[PDB]
């Protein structure tokens, strides 16, 4: 899903050519590109700091994740590496969404099957919600670029 694929899908589901109704939708996608790309460029330049910062905020909000025995926890070097990896996956998905003007990349690569994974591996949604909140609180963006970044971050929180 991007505004462009959605426009096509809407036309194709009715067996018809693209109309102005869909061309105007794509115009909107181009109009918001400046903000989306400002956010994508900033989040990307700051990726290392935001990822490692978020991981540390999560352990401090939930100190038990540093100490409880079990593979689901960041109480080992392996666990910590998994946690930072995961948060990096979320931040990367946010940038992909920004770049395409839609939730598609997060939907396909991350949200589909998310509930099943968290349940199976005993990962708590709250840990990732805090990481996401740290990113939101710490990206340092302003204006419509912050709106854009926060829309997708909040999309993940809702998921």
């Amino acid at each position: 899903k991007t505004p462009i694929t959605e426009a096509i899908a809407a036309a194709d589901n009715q067996g018809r050519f693209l109309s102005n109704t869909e061309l105007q939708a794509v115009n909107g996608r181009y109009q918001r590109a400046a903000a989306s790309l400002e956010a994508a460029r900033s989040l990307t330049s700051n990726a290392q700091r935001l990822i490692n910062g978020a991981a540390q905020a999560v352990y401090s909000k939930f100190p038990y994740t540093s100490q409880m025995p079990g593979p689901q926890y960041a109480s080992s070097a392996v666990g910590k590496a998994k946690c930072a990896r995961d948060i990096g996956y979320y931040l990367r998905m946010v940038t992909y969404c920004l770049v395409v003007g839609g939730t598609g990349p997060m939907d396909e690569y991350l949200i589909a099957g998310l509930e099943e994974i968290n349940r199976t591996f005993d990962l708590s949604p709250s840990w990732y919600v805090e990481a996401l909140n740290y990113v939101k609180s710490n990206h340092g963006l302003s204006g419509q670029a912050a709106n854009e970044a926060n829309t997708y971050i909040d999309y993940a929180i809702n998921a």
Partner: protein
């Protein structure tokens, strides 16, 4: 996929953020956006005449298609034939707005050569039909009249590739 989603999908397979150079290239696609919408709008706004004039030229060139015993003889076959020309132009037009041929490959062309071979539809004559729509579509898209003057050569080349891709596929 659209062209932006393609770049993302390649990057996700490598586990990477997009580089500034790739974000620059995506920016550039946005700068070409108004031109691309003109292209889609112009082809679409003339779709009926594009299909009809190409089919007419095809049947004119290849009268055996419409003669009794011909694959486009009878109104049911002629109607199927016109619908194929429309469908192909429709999917080509989706590829142009997407800046990517995956929708045209996935939903139209994949398996079509086989389809025609099984039905006895002359794929090569289809190809001729598609190439005439190409020529008309580009002449229409690239008409210097009634639009802000600028250079659409890159786009017209790209449009070319989708029509050629279809003609090759059939």
């Amino acid at each position: 996929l659209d062209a932006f989603a393609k770049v993302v999908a390649q990057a996700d397979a490598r586990g990477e953020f997009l580089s500034n150079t790739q974000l620059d290239a995506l920016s550039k696609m946005v700068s070409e956006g108004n031109k691309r919408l003109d292209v889609v709008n112009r082809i679409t706004s003339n779709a009926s005449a594009i299909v009809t004039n190409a089919a007419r030229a095809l049947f004119s060139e290849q009268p055996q298609l419409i003669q009794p015993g011909g694959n486009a003889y009878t109104n049911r076959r002629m109607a199927a034939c016109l619908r194929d020309m429309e469908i192909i132009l429709r999917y080509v037009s989706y590829a142009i707005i997407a800046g990517d041929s995956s929708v045209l490959d996935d939903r139209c062309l994949n398996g079509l050569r086989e389809t025609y071979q099984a039905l006895g539809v002359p794929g090569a004559s289809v190809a001729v039909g598609v190439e005439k729509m190409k020529d008309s579509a580009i002449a229409i898209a690239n008409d210097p009249s009634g639009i802000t003057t600028g250079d659409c050569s890159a786009l017209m080349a790209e449009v070319g590739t989708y029509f050629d891709r279809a003609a090759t596929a059939v």
